DNA sequence: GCGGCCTCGGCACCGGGATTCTCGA
DNA sequence: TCGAGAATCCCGGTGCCGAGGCCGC
């Protein structure tokens, strides 16, 4: 019902936009993402978006705050060096907007 | 340094006892004199069976010589794996004027890999 | 010292004999563990906006390490491993004077 | 293209355990970026272990062997 | 809904990745076996030709 | 072993990073973090030992353990 | 009567009054009552290492769960110095109705990998029942098969809780030849294994062993040559069977087998060693083979 | 060169290969 | 009559507990 219509509709949206991303990243390394491969990577995006939501809420709770700001996702970007460097420049590009 | 080769070497190196580690590892020629000092043969069994096989990981050990390791292991442990005796018999004529070890190695491997 | 304390505790935590050559590398593992931690406490305490590192500053970090959950909170984790006179400092008991 | 605004509002707000927490568009488009690079990173790690096995296809098992470091890393 | 009762109609009434992968592997194995029969049988034809 | 060094963890937290204000018993939390990190190390290294069926933990199992758990224990 | 009867029994046994036990050929023992077919069939082709077990003080076939826990908590504690212990009454391993019901002791490790499978049985052992009081449930036979380490742990537990003592039952070559003769005298069909007699000569420097393995039907026809009185085999008939083996071996190899000692007598009925690792129970004669084995255990106890 | 430590190895019990011998092409 | 399937005789290839070696007091 509502839980199913919620998460299946966003599973559909994740698959649709992630398939657009699959066509957008399949042209770099001349690769093809098979139907089960897209189906998997979409559900890992879903399952670890659960992880990002779990992290980000308590990240705001950690600063005695209710809203989620850029330092919270920076702590989400704190995890790994390569995407620290990637997200630093993408974050200054965020600030350009 | 391969499947059924590196772990095969591991399984034939824990087979050989600690006393004759030098004796069998010197004869199979992959570990030259310089390689013997790197591994401390007197320390432990799992230590040597892990450092020696690494010394073949750098030496890219192949089954052709991994099997030679097993041969040299059995040359000092021939008192296991009970042995049958086969007796050949030539008919009337001169003996085998050509048992070339190269030719015999060829005439054995060719016939065996034929079937 | 303390790294030698943890490698000896590794012996009673791994329940299985290991090698000393394994222990000086787990020493580098603890050194890098702090090389990630003390600047992870750094960045997490800076995230809270506080100069000091309060206990909840580390509860979030251990939530990051997946050891604090909605099932396993911070304090329950203290029950299972720390000795009594040490968890008396951490988890608030009650005397009408909760620590 | 990307993972759009009315969809990033909806997907993140589904896993939100309370109704009163919002994520702003400034952070929303960066969330788009972080899960877009979730796809990019998972895909590049999969195809990287694919050249490591030298494949022209990303199969089922490659993704399963990349999760133990994907979820650990990302 | 009809797909969930399709579940309730098939699974209630009543490997695959191993199927596909192992079947391709075993098909290469049968190609190797056809090569084996080509080699062994032909060398048998030459041996019994001798 | 039934101990937890008060002095050593504080000395490490001061040597490695000179600018913090770790609380009265915050170093006790650091000890708990390292205790659980070495728990994970011991258990996943036991898993590594069973992976190669080695009855003694060695270097080649600890180095594989590090890149999983130490990275996992990063905040 | 409560002890003095046993003293008179000891007197009779030590007297050694004309022993030759003309024994009835082990009769086909149709499996009595329950005798769990799965359990008994699992218990047949297992090499039981015999022991002699003194009667158990204060034992009851109701408190099996309590002893199971008390021994399980003791075995895993001997590992401190994964395992389940299932005491299981066998309900049918008894010769007469008054014998104590045989019960098992299995070291079950996850799945049913029975590591040890102990076995105490008292069949046709009414030379011990009528001499011991009611408090003791006497099971002269103990059957190991698990490692000797686990046997030397459950035996210690049994000594500690029941005051029963395990002497390792060693079948002397005389009793071994007896059982080797009454098992080729049986009326079986489809002989499972050849009748092998593993001799072992008493040379001081060397330890040559002989496996005088006869075709099982050929040994039955050789037994019929020396079998004259039916129903019961005598000591002279057993000795003549063994001497026909001797005069077929010294005839061939000029070495007097009678100058050697039996160490193992494999037969289609039941293999039987000397040093203890004795009773394999190939066929379902085990109530008769066990009858002989219990009668031999009385000899060691009494 | 011994004290509680450990590691090979004879003996032995349990798991597949080819011979029996029964059934299908 | 003969060809594949199952069981089981013959001996492994394995499991696992004493013996020998070896490093503090």
UniProtKB/Swiss-Prot annotation, chain B:
Subcellular location: Nucleus; Chromosome, Centromere, Kinetochore
Subunit structure: Component of the CENPA-NAC complex, at least composed of CENPA, CENPC, CENPH, CENPM, CENPN, CENPT and CENPU. The CENPA-NAC complex interacts with the CENPA-CAD complex, composed of CENPI, CENPK, CENPL, CENPO, CENPP, CENPQ, CENPR and CENPS. Interacts directly with CENPA. Identified in a centromere complex containing histones H2A, H2B and H4, and at least CENPA, CENPB, CENPC, CENPT, CENPN, HJURP, SUPT16H, SSRP1 and RSF1.
Family: Belongs to the CENP-N/CHL4 family.
The protein's role, per its UniProt record: Component of the CENPA-NAC (nucleosome-associated) complex, a complex that plays a central role in assembly of kinetochore proteins, mitotic progression and chromosome segregation. The CENPA-NAC complex recruits the CENPA-CAD (nucleosome distal) complex and may be involved in incorporation of newly synthesized CENPA into centromeres. CENPN is the first protein to bind specifically to CENPA nucleosomes and the direct binding of CENPA nucleosomes by CENPN is required for centromere assembly. Required for chromosome congression and efficiently align the chromosomes on a metaphase plate.
Protein's recorded name: Centromere protein N
Record gene name: CENPN
From-to range in the entire protein, with total length: 1 to 115 of 339
Curated annotation (Swiss-Prot), chain C:
Family note: Belongs to the CENP-T/CNN1 family.
Gene: CENPT
Subunit annotation: Component of the CENPA-CAD complex, composed of CENPI, CENPK, CENPL, CENPO, CENPP, CENPQ, CENPR and CENPS. The CENPA-CAD complex is probably recruited on centromeres by the CENPA-NAC complex, at least composed of CENPA, CENPC, CENPH, CENPM, CENPN, CENPT and CENPU. Identified in a centromeric complex containing histones H2A, H2B, H3 and H4, and at least CENPA, CENPB, CENPC, CENPT, CENPN, HJURP, SUPT16H, SSRP1 and RSF1. Interacts (via N-terminus) with the NDC80 complex.
Domain notes: The largest part of the sequence forms an elongated and flexible stalk structure that is connected to a C-terminal globular domain with a histone-type fold.
Associated disorder: Short stature and microcephaly with genital anomalies: An autosomal recessive disease characterized by growth failure resulting in severe short stature, severe microcephaly, and delayed and dissociated bone age. Additional features include global psychomotor developmental delay, pubertal delay and genital anomalies.
Natural source organism: Homo sapiens
Subcellular location per the Swiss-Prot or TrEMBL entry: Nucleus; Chromosome, Centromere; Chromosome, Centromere, Kinetochore
Protein name as it appears in the record: Centromere protein T
Domain of life: Eukaryota
Swiss-Prot record, chain E:
Top-rank taxon, per record: Eukaryota
Subcellular location: Nucleus; Chromosome, Centromere
Subunit and interaction comment: Component of the CENPA-CAD complex, composed of CENPI, CENPK, CENPL, CENPO, CENPP, CENPQ, CENPR and CENPS. The CENPA-CAD complex interacts with the CENPA-NAC complex, at least composed of CENPA, CENPC, CENPH, CENPM, CENPN, CENPT and CENPU.
Sequence similarity: Belongs to the CENP-Q/OKP1 family.
Described function: Component of the CENPA-CAD (nucleosome distal) complex, a complex recruited to centromeres which is involved in assembly of kinetochore proteins, mitotic progression and chromosome segregation. May be involved in incorporation of newly synthesized CENPA into centromeres via its interaction with the CENPA-NAC complex. Plays an important role in chromosome congression and in the recruitment of CENP-O complex (which comprises CENPO, CENPP, CENPQ and CENPU), CENPE and PLK1 to the kinetochores.
Listed name of the protein: Centromere protein Q
Species of origin: Homo sapiens
Included range, full protein: 111 to 165 of 268
From Swiss-Prot, chain F:
Role played: Component of the CENPA-NAC (nucleosome-associated) complex, a complex that plays a central role in assembly of kinetochore proteins, mitotic progression and chromosome segregation. The CENPA-NAC complex recruits the CENPA-CAD (nucleosome distal) complex and may be involved in incorporation of newly synthesized CENPA into centromeres. Part of a nucleosome-associated complex that binds specifically to histone H3-containing nucleosomes at the centromere, as opposed to nucleosomes containing CENPA.
Tissue expression: Highly expressed in ovary, liver, lung and pancreas and to a lower extent in breast and gastrointestinal tract cancers; such as those of the colon, rectum and stomach. Overexpressed in high grade breast invasive tumors. Expressed in many cancer cell types.
Pfam families for this protein: CENP-W (PF15510)
Listed InterPro entries: CENP-W, CENP-W/WIP1, Histone-fold
Keyword Membrane included in the entry's annotation: no
Recorded GO CC terms: chromosome, centromeric region; inner kinetochore; kinetochore; nuclear matrix; nucleolus; nucleoplasm; nucleus
Gene: CENPW
GO molecular function: DNA binding; protein heterodimerization activity
Keywords, comma-separated and alphabetical: Cell cycle, Cell division, Centromere, Chromosome, DNA-binding, Kinetochore, Mitosis, Nucleus
Name of the protein this chain belongs to: Centromere protein W
Keyword Transit peptide: no
SUPFAM superfamilies: Histone-fold
């Amino acid at each position: 019902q509502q839980r199913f219509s919620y998460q299946q509709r966003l599973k559909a949206a994740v698959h649709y936009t992630v398939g657009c991303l699959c066509e957008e990243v399949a042209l770099d390394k001349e690769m093809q993402f098979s139907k089960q491969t897209i189906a998997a990577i979409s559900e890992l995006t879903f399952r670890q978006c659960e992880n990002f939501a779990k992290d980000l809420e308590m990240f705001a709770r950690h600063a005695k705050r209710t809203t989620i700001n850029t330092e919270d996702v920076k702590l989400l970007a704190r995890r790994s060096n390569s995407l620290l460097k990637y997200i630093t420049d993408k974050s200054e590009e965020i600030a350009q907007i | 340094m391969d499947e059924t080769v590196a772990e095969f070497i591991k399984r034939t190196i824990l087979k050989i006892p600690m006393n004759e580690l030098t004796t069998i590892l010197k004869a199979w020629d992959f570990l030259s004199e310089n390689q013997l000092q790197t591994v401390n043969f007197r320390q432990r069994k799992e230590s040597v069976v892990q450092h020696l096989i690494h010394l073949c990981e750098e030496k890219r050990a192949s089954i052709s010589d991994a099997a030679l390791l097993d041969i040299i292991y059995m040359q000092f442990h021939q008192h296991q794996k009970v042995w049958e005796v086969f007796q050949m018999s030539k008919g009337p004529g001169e003996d085998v004027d050509l048992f070339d070890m190269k030719q015999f190695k060829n005439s054995f491997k060719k016939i065996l890999q034929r079937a | 010292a303390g790294l030698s304390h943890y490698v000896k505790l590794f012996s009673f935590y791994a329940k299985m004999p290991m090698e000393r050559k394994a222990l000086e590398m787990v020493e580098k593992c603890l050194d890098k563990y702090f090389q990630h931690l003390c600047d992870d406490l750094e960045v997490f305490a800076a995230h809270a906006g506080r100069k000091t590192v309060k206990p909840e500053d580390l509860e979030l970090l251990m939530r990051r390490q997946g050891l604090v959950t909605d099932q396993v909170s911070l304090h329950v984790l203290v029950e299972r491993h720390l000795p009594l006179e040490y968890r008396q400092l951490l988890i608030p008991c009650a005397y009408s004077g909760n620590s | 293209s990307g993972f759009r605004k009315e969809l990033v509002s909806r997907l993140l707000h589904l896993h939100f355990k309370d109704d009163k927490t919002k994520v702003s568009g400034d952070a929303l488009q960066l969330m788009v970026e972080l899960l877009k690079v979730f796809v990019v990173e998972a895909a590049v790690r999969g195809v990287r272990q694919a050249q490591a096995e030298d494949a022209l296809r990303v199969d089922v098992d490659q993704l399963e062997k990349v999760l133990p470091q994907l979820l650990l890393d990302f | 809904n009809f797909l969930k009762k399709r579940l309730l109609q098939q699974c209630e009434t009543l490997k695959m990745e191993d199927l596909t992968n192992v079947s391709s592997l075993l098909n290469m194995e049968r190609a190797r076996d056809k090569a084996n029969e080509e080699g062994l049988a032909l060398l048998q034809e030459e041996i019994d030709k001798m | 072993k039934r101990k937890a060094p008060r002095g050593f963890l504080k000395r490490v937290f001061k040597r490695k990073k000179p600018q913090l204000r770790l609380e009265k018993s915050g170093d006790l939390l650091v000890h708990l973090n390292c205790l659980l990190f070495v728990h994970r190390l011991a258990e996943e290294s036991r898993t590594n030992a069973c992976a190669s069926k080695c009855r003694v933990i060695n270097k080649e199992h600890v180095l594989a353990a590090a890149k999983v758990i130490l990275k996992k224990s990063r905040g | 009567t409560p002890l003095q009867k046993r003293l008179e029994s000891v007197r009779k046994q030590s007297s050694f009054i004309l022993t030759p036990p003309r024994r009835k050929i082990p009769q086909c023992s149709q499996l009595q009552e329950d005798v769990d077919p799965q359990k008994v069939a699992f218990l047949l082709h297992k090499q039981w290492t015999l022991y002699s077990l003194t009667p158990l003080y204060k034992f009851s076939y109701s408190n099996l769960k309590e002893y199971s826990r008390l021994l399980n908590a003791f075995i895993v504690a001997e590992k401190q110095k994964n395992i389940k212990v299932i005491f299981s009454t066998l309900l049918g391993m008894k010769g007469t109705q008054r014998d104590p019901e045989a019960f098992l002791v299995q070291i079950v490790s996850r799945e049913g990998k029975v590591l040890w499978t102990g076995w105490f049985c008292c069949v046709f052992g009414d030379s011990l029942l009528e001499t011991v009081s009611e408090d003791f449930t006497c099971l002269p036979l103990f059957l190991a098969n698990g490692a000797e380490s686990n046997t030397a742990i459950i035996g210690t537990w049994f000594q500690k809780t029941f005051d029963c003592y395990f002497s390792p039952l060693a079948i002397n070559a005389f009793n071994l030849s007896w059982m080797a003769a009454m098992w080729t005298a049986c009326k079986m069909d489809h002989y499972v294994a050849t009748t092998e007699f593993l001799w072992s000569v008493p040379c001081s420097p060397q330890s040559l062993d002989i496996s005088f393995a006869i075709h099982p039907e050929d040994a039955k026809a050789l037994w019929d040559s020396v079998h004259k009185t039916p129903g019961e085999v005598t000591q002279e008939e057993v000795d003549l069977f063994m001497d026909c083996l001797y005069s077929h071996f010294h005839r061939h190899f000029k070495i007097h087998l009678s100058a050697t000692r039996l160490v193992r007598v494999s037969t289609s009925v039941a293999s039987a060693h000397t040093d203890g690792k004795i009773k394999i129970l190939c066929h379902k004669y085990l109530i008769g083979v066990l009858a002989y084995l219990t009668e031999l255990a009385i000899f060691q106890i009494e």
